[PDB]
Every structure is written in C-alpha cells, then in structure tokens.
Amino acid sequence: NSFITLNPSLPNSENSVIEAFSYKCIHCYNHHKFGTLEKLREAFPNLHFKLYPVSLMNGEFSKEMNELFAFAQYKDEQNGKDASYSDSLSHKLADVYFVSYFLNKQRNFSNLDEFYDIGLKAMNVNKNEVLNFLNTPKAKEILSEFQRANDIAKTYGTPAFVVNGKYQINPSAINSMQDLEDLVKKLSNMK
C-alpha cells in the first residue's frame, strides 16, 4: 500500500506534514537540499510543516539534538515560520548538521559543548536561551512528541512523511517530487 494509518494519531498535527528524519540519513539530506518541504508549502500553503528528529539514529548527542530541534520548533512557531522556510531556525539547524556529517565528513564531535555550539551558532542564539526554554512546559511537550519518531522510523526507515498526524507514506511510493505532492493532496483531504 502507498501509506499506513497511525493509531493513535499524533498530537498537534492538524493540517500538517511531519517529516521524521536523521541527520545521518542521506535520503533525508537529499530532501533537505532539494527543498522538499519548501516546495510542499508552495503547493499546499494551508499546511504546517515540522521536523521530528529520530533519536535512535542520531548518535552520541541524540538527546541534545532533540533539545535543539525542540527549541527551533518553538522559536519558529513564535516567529510565524516552520521547517518549510529556508530561513527558519529548524532549517538552519538541520543544514549545519547535514553539512557537518556529509560534506565535512565529521565522524564525531569532541565533546558536548562543541556539538551544542555548532547548533547554537547556526540558530544565532546563546546557550542560556535554549537552557531556559528547556525548563518550560512547552519544551517538555515538544520533546514528548519527538518520542514517537523512533517508532515511526522503524516501519520503513527515514525520511518518513506523515500527513495530518494520521497517514504515514510508504517511501517506495515516492519516486519524484510530483509523486509526493500527489500523495499529500490525496491524504490531506481524507478523514
């Protein structure tokens, strides 16, 4: 089948596409470079777009990567943007780690401060702003939602696209931008 139905459906996912991704996943990188989410916004300007990092795939600093993406989600939403914008914090944050891993072939980060600072500088924020955010109820809610990314990723791998929190697309059904546009229009308009 071209998609499966999630049960239960995801919270805070009405009128949306969520991409579960890993910064070590070359197909994720390809969608990032290609601008898949920006192009989906172009075709579906009514939808919201969110990245779900898959912590089981993100290595030594996987918990801290989730912290930085949760912050980026919160800040982008505050600013009326989301991950389908090239200037968003979420997109900038994904870019710096994709570049680190795939184009600078950085196997590891020396230590946690070095890892964190790469994300802090990509988002042009200081550590105090992120750590203060992590003590708030909204941070715990956002991180709690990311927990589902691992189970979502086990079905078919990454990236996993999920429409309206309910319909998870089988990657074998996607062979072009047009295919993915067609499935999002079909699935976005079901119950």
Residue numbers in the entry: 4 to 194
Extract from the study:
The oxidative part of this network consists of two monomeric DsbAs (DsbA1 and DsbA2) related to EcDsbL, which cooperate with one DsbB. The solved structures of both CjDsbAs, especially the length and amino acid sequences of their L2 and L3 loops that are essential elements of the monomeric thiol oxidoreductases, were different from that of EcDsbA but similar, though not identical, to that of EcDsbL, which affected their functioning.
CjDsbA1 crystallized in the C2 and P212121 space group containing two monomers in the ASU for the monoclinic form and one molecule per ASU for the orthorhombic form, while CjDsbA2 crystallized in P3221 with a single chain in the ASU. The superposition of monoclinic and orthorhombic forms of CjDsbA1 showed relatively small differences between them, which was confirmed by an RMSD value of 0.45 Å. The active site of CjDsbA1 was observed in the reduced form, while the CjDsbA2 formed a clear disulfide bond. Previously, we found that CjDsbA1 present in wild-type (wt) cells was present in its oxidized form, but it was mainly present in its reduced form in cells lacking CjDsbB; also, the lack of CjDsbA2 had no impact on its redox state. First of all, in E. coli JCB817, CjDsbA1 formed higher molecular weight oligomeric complexes (~46 kDa), which disappeared when cells were treated with the reducing agent DTT; in E. coli JCB818 lacking EcDsbB, these complexes migrated slower when compared to their mobility in E. coli JCB817.
